[PDB]
Amino acid sequence: TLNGGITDMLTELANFEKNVSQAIHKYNAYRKAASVIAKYPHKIKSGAEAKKLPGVGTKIAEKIDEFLATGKLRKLEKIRQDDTSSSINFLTRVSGIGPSAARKFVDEGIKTLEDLRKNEDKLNHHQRIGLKYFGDFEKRIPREEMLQMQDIVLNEVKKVDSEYIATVCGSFRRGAESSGDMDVLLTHPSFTSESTKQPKLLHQVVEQLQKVHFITDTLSKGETKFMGVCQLPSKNDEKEYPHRRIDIRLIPKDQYYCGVLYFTGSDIFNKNMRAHALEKGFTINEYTIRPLGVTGVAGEPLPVDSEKDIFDYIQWKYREPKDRSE
DNA sequence: CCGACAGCGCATCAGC
DNA sequence: GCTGATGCGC
DNA sequence: GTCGG
Numbered sequence A: 001t002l003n004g005g006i007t008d009m010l011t012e013l014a015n016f017e018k019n020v021s022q023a024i025h026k027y028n029a030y031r032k033a034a035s036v037i038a039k040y041p042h043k044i045k046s047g048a049e050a051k052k053l054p055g056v057g058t059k060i061a062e063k064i065d066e067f068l069a070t071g072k073l074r075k076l077e078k079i080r081q082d083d084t085s086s087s088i089n090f091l092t093r094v095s096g097i098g099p100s101a102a103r104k105f106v107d108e109g110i111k112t113l114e115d116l117r118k119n120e121d122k123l124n125h126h127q128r129i130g131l132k133y134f135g136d137f138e139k140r141i142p143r144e145e146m147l148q149m150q151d152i153v154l155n156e157v158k159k160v161d162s163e164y165i166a167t168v169c170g171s172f173r174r175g176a177e178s179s180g181d182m183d184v185l186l187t188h189p190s191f192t193s194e195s196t197k198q199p200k201l202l203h204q205v206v207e208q209l210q211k212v213h214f215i216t217d218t219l220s221k222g223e224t225k226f227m228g229v230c231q232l233p234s235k236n237d238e239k240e241y242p243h244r245r246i247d248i249r250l251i252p253k254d255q256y257y258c259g260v261l262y263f264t265g266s267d268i269f270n271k272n273m274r275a276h277a278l279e280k281g282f283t284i285n286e287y288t289i290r291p292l293g294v295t296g297v298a299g300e301p302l303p304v305d306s307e308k309d310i311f312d313y314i315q316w317k318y319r320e321p322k323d324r325s326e
Numbered sequence B: 001c002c003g004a005c006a007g008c009g010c011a012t013c014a015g016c
Numbered sequence C: 001g002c003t004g005a006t007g008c009g010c
Numbered sequence D: 001g002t003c004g005g
């Protein structure tokens, strides 16, 4: 947390560009700068120093100097006072409400938690659940709770079919002491890139988890991706645990490594790695790593037997999950 | 100084 | 109904 | 907003 003041400033700016300006490349730019500054092992003394880092340019360097000199950023002080920008930023905190829906709601006079609550019929399903658990989804998940959640999921999955393999990824796999949610990667021998010999593979599991009351709500559900809500059971006379976001992704068993790499992240780590792959003449997604033809057309999937193989293709030394938190 | 910026599942919509 | 674009959350 | 060619 050497440069927490600066990284928070950049994150707020990033959020403004994404939610209010609807400028996603500026959003990513600010996040990249925040990320590289966050891992910089020195307490930054000037914009010039920061500008030496990849991702920090002239503009951000100037902002860093203002921040260092005054402890504030006028551009942000103004934004904080703009009611429309403030309303839009708030509404986007509800899962399901993005930049477009937020502005739309503001236009229609809906701009507070109270307004949302009285206008549920104006929200789609995902948004309705996001509002319902607004407060809970704001809370972090202690690793101790992630362990109990892992136990339940793996044991219930085993009960459905012992051939299932569920792996908890995301920040948990990176060893974080707290997570924003739970990310489960799921595989089954019947589902491969070659064939889908058994249907309802994801459904069955989701069903079992709901049966035992672990999964409480569903945001979206398809053949391979489930996004919903879950909750740990509490003891007698015990206050209930907060509801949590859970994502379950069923990936072809032979594509497990590309899958676990993607689901482990971080998000910024994935973007940096996928961008580097391109510069190296490859393209990476959660399923495969393919070379780029002389015309920029993806070729056939390359053989992969470990996450390291992916790193080797793009000439990157291997990095354990714990070192991918960018 | 301009084009590129990672890549994709599900929900929702418009147009036919 | 299907296709394809858009919004959204990764 | 930043960076490479």
Ligand SMILES: Nc1nc2c([nH]c(=O)n2[C@H]2C[C@H](O)[C@@H](COP(=O)(O)OP(=O)(O)OP(=O)(O)O)O2)c(=O)[nH]1
Pocket (backbone or CB within 6 Å): A169, A170, A171, A172, A178, A179, A180, A181, A182, A183, A262, A263, A264, A265, A266, A267, A270, C010
């Ligand atoms: N948040 C996010 N995750 C992404 C993106 N693209 C992408 O491949 N991912 C991957 C890397 C993440 O580790 C993984 C799971 O998403 P996540 O939001 O749960 O991220 P996380 O587990 O690292 O962090 P968290 O839950 O503790 O907030 O999805 C993206 O744009 N945003």
Ligand SMILES: [Cl-]
Pocket (backbone or CB within 6 Å): A022, A023, A024, A025, A026, A027
């Ligand atoms: Cl942009």
Ligand SMILES: [Cl-]
Pocket (backbone or CB within 6 Å): A009, A071, A072, A073, A074, A076, A077
């Ligand atoms: Cl500020």
Ligand SMILES: [Cl-]
Pocket (backbone or CB within 6 Å): A285, A287, A288
């Ligand atoms: Cl693919």
Ligand SMILES: [Mg+2]
Pocket (backbone or CB within 6 Å): A170, A171, A179, A180, A181, A182, A183
């Ligand atoms: Mg997560």
Ligand code: NA
Pocket (backbone or CB within 6 Å): A050, A051, A052, A053, A054, A055, A056, A057
């Ligand atoms: Na720089």
Ligand code: NA
Pocket (backbone or CB within 6 Å): A091, A092, A093, A094, A095, A096, A097, A098
């Ligand atoms: Na949102």
Ligand code: NA
Pocket (backbone or CB within 6 Å): A170, A181, A182, A183, A246, A247
């Ligand atoms: Na997640």
